[model samples]
Target chain A: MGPAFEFAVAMMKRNSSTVKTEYGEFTMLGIYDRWAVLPRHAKPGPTILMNDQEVGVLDAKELVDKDGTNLELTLLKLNRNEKFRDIRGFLAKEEVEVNEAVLAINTSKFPNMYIPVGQVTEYGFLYLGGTPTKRMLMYNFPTRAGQCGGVLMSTGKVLGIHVGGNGHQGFSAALLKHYFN
Target chain B: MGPAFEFAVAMMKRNSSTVKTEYGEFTMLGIYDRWAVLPRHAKPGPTILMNDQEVGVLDAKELVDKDGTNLELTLLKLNRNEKFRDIRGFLAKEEVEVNEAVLAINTSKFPNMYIPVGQVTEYGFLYLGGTPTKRMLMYNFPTRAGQCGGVLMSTGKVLGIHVGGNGHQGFSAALLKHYFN
Candidate 1:
């Protein structure tokens, strides 16, 4: 298989997650790439999991606009494990301020890069949401399940993981703090 | 029919739109209650529409967090129609800077609110993709076709028209300039 195909399969193996909100529990399985997470609201006794193992919650924020509506999201961080080693290395690249150029390998359809999936896809565009901290790279791609997460790569370096888009609603990616900082 | 049912029907009749991006043209038929707009990474020939008729395109924004992926969204404003006349009045009451107290009525499943739709549903939460202008009202509610647009209402007032959420993604509402100004 080509490097692209090989890389695709590598991502899918560990891209499943679950969250326990007060309302109920949901299965949000996909790419567990960036490691950072965002949530809708603070659920009653909320629990988050990846690869069937529970990951701890980090922070949640309520974003509001004047004469507008609220934008609520939460962040989750996983416990240090073997996965972190690989992810960190993937993120480990020449840290430079970059925007507009990136690639997203979705596990939902192309979970296994090694194995062929879907017909063909294209990189739509870049969207910056939540105010850029590092002028990070973002893009737009047709998403089957925007709920499912995916891994973002820029210049072959890992940019972060994106929580796909809904409607005109764009995808959200969590960048690597190690480099963003 | 009761005012609630009547109001519901009124909202649906005028809640459809069309968008022509660089890629192609799409029918983004849904709610048109809000009064703000956002955009994607400048489409080659981007065009936006409301109520079958061509509505002018406004500014669109990309929200990017530190290392977090982009939250792509746009703000849109509508012409002064009957819908705006009543909604503005509704928002005028107790207008002292308020955020987070509102509800959304989606028409994908509840297209005809007077009639039966789903078995049971509850409020979800608000998710601000872009930088909110006034920290306006937002909430979490069930979305029918995340691909389709929906209306955002709170306390009988038409809060705004929302573009549904993907996963835990929330509806995005256009703000009222009167209040925002």
Candidate 2:
């Protein structure tokens, strides 16, 4: 692993969590202030397992930005008693270009992680036949099962959250600005 | 493109051809002796387009080897008059190990190829339901449609043929030994 990948691993180890939902096990990529971020489709149940144990029921809500588009992200509001060692940041304020090197980090195989480095192949529309219609960043990262909610990072900043489609597609992190505000 | 990729490009320019069938457009990776090799699923028609021109009807057969299992490959017998500048070699006689650097060459996009470098991720069985039951070398190569017949090479030797599944899976080149004999 390179420095960028090392940085991603360090960040994940500090703030990431294992999210077990009715659907399956996914990853909570990072702690963004008072929220833990993951893919919307992961659908964290009312009483979901946080870090493999019942940490108490939390609020998981979909973020519909002012543009009225859902970003395919689910924000799990952390209880005041819950504490994340660090609050990770994203590239929400920066522009991501094609061909930029990126990494798709999956803790699903944690301890034996699945972190593959790739470049941005394209940023295009991924129509899933419903509400949120937005262009996403497509990378060449090879992804597998149990990686649905994995994070895509570049230069130590979150670029997107894995939504679906063979692990090449994701919801761009620029949408995270909505949650930040 | 690096030297290895440049070499692949040069070889593709000399021995590769565009194949059009009733199923769809795919790539005929290279000329091996008197046969042109491609993915079986590409399903070349009796009178298929070679290099965009209608070539004379040709015999497209599946090599069952002596093992009596289909290798997901189609070998099209070329006419006696047809000539190839070169015959690409495979790593068939050699061993392929996990984490070995590899390149997936897809000429489907032709002049604007989709050749991504990756490493052998694993060697596992891909139960695509029937016929061929062989272990394939899985890579982190990112693939897209129209790339089914592309070749996976390592150290400039053909390692496998792209079959499907997000471009990470393929039919190992060791099976090519059957066609060689």
Candidate 3:
């Protein structure tokens, strides 16, 4: 792993945690894949990354579930977010465009796990049966934990944030576009 | 089942069917939940109904899976679509907004099943996650079939166009916001 990969790991180690919602709460795996396009209905909040000697809050927010459900997944945004800077080409289009097996981290449950996985499906944007619209991606990755939201890594690159799945509902990399595109 | 319920059923009975894609083509369940913002990647195509007669053509679009996978999920968009017409207030704010058990159709490999189900998880848009900055809604519902892309209905209303699942990896409602909101 290079500096970018290490920085992502360190961030997950320090701040990645959970969030609270109106009905209940879910985990805040990390941040969104894109650094732009702030969505609507998100709530500002806090995160954890306390040092043994001193303590401070990791700025965070609750991602508003577009379906309007009760799962309180959070959206972490940071200016100096090492991942955002593409410090070492982790999010470079050329670096992640190719498909292959990747690594993902699970910290919601204790003893965090790093699992390697592969792609199961993909789609290019097509309208009227022959035009570009948007992209959809899925993988055979799953998080064996109580909550969803985790970091997906491959060769020290960010594949996507594992959004849904229990044990193995199969993992979804909705955030993979940021790295691949 | 009231007229609203029966009407939804009738439409599925007459027009509901399967589709084709690069890997193998699956079913194109019907439209999304709500009739709101149309995602850019969806392609308007044709759907099937029994009767041995091509009932004109149901204008629709295939909702490509984010991972570039095999399943062929679809999104149904329309100008005078019944769901968009606000017929009988079935698409009313109060009717579709409440979180509860709903009806969904499954015509994949077996005889159609109107199974009653619930939500398993949800999310809010955030930066730094993965590919494409759109929200995907998943569910605990699915139909046993060779590929994904089936319609999810409930209480005589469309929940989401079931996008993924193998047999029953547990269904995911990608277009769920249409109904939940």
Clashes of each: 53, 0, 51
Q: Which candidate number maximizes lDDT?
A: 2
Stretches off by above 4 angstroms in model 1 are A14-46, A52-75, A79-83, A92-136, A143-148, A154-156, A163-174, A177-181, B1-181
At residue B33, give the lDDT of candidate 1.
52
- What lDDT is reached at residue A133 by model 2? 43
**Model 2 misplaced regions, further than 4 Å:** A1-36, A39-43, A47-57, A64-72, A77-95, A98-152, A162-171, A175-181, B1-57, B64-72, B77-98, B101-151, B162-171, B175-181
DockQ of candidate model 3? 0.01
In the range A120-179, model 2's lDDT, one tens digit per residue, is 544554565365545466665434445567666655566667766544443443334446
Each prediction's TM-score versus the true structure: 0.30, 0.48, 0.29
lDDT of 1 by residue, B18-134 (tens): 444444333232223544333222241233443345554443334333454433334344443533323344433322222322222222212112111111122222343453222
- Better lDDT candidate (1, 3): 3
Ordering by TM-score: 2, 1, 3
Worst 10 residues of 1 chain A by lDDT: A111-120
lDDT of 3 at B129: 16
Model 3 ranges with Cα > 4 A deviation: A1-181, B1-11, B18-103, B106-108, B124-133, B142-147, B165-181
